[PDB]
């Protein structure tokens, strides 16, 4: 859930401007250009902050979490009311926090989108992706890593 919280009885302690941005609700990218291309597609499952693939079946084609050679873009935002996802095409470079497979990724490591759309450490990569930080634990299973995704490689 992008914004899972719905109700509470106290205010969370957030009185320090440092290290407030590594959260699951921080949609978009860390650095963004006005000329970035953004598309919206219907989605099934939960592709938020994950690499996505097109699925064709009667309804128009949709997007869902996936990687490998079927990668089409990265989902950086969703609207839960209308069930539409904001996608940056793979031909457009991106920089921001994305879902990581586990807590083993370190800085300067090259990464690959797996079947679930999660980034994992790599010869086997079809795209360029470099980890800029270490993996952070947002939940018991959720890890976020800061990554710059820039185009695709020429060979495996």
């Amino acid at each position: 859930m992008k914004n899972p919280q719905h109700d509470a009885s106290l205010l969370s302690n957030s009185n320090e401007f440092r290290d407030k941005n590594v959260e699951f609700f921080a949609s978009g990218g860390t650095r963004t250009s006005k000329f970035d291309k953004l598309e919206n597609h219907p989605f099934l499952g939960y592709p938020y902050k994950r690499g996505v693939k097109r699925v064709i079946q009667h309804y128009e084609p949709h997007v869902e979490a996936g990687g490998g050679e079927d990668l089409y873009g990265i989902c950086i935002d969703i609207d839960e009311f209308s069930k539409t996802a904001t996608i940056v095409p793979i031909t457009n470079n991106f920089e921001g926090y994305l879902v990581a497979k586990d807590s083993t990724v370190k800085v300067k490591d090259k990464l690959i989108f797996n079947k679930d759309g999660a980034l994992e450490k790599v010869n086997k990569a079809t795209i360029n992706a470099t980890a800029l930080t270490d993996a952070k634990q947002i939940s018991n299973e959720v890890y976020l890593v800061k990554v710059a995704v820039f185009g695709n490689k020429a060979m495996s």
């Binding site: 219907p42 009667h58 309804y59 128009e60 949709h62 009311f81 209308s82 069930k83």
Partner: protein, 53 residues
Amino acid sequence: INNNLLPFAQAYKLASSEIIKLINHFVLTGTVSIQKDGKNQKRLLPNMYGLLN
């Protein structure tokens, strides 16, 4: 004519007419599609129905 370019008023009138036809089709049938077969429909929200569905 060589490039199919219109003045703004004429282009707006034509586009508005096409959109109104789409709206009438949705109101009658409750579906949104541009194919004569009725396939490749746009997925809509629940609690959004026409007279036919």
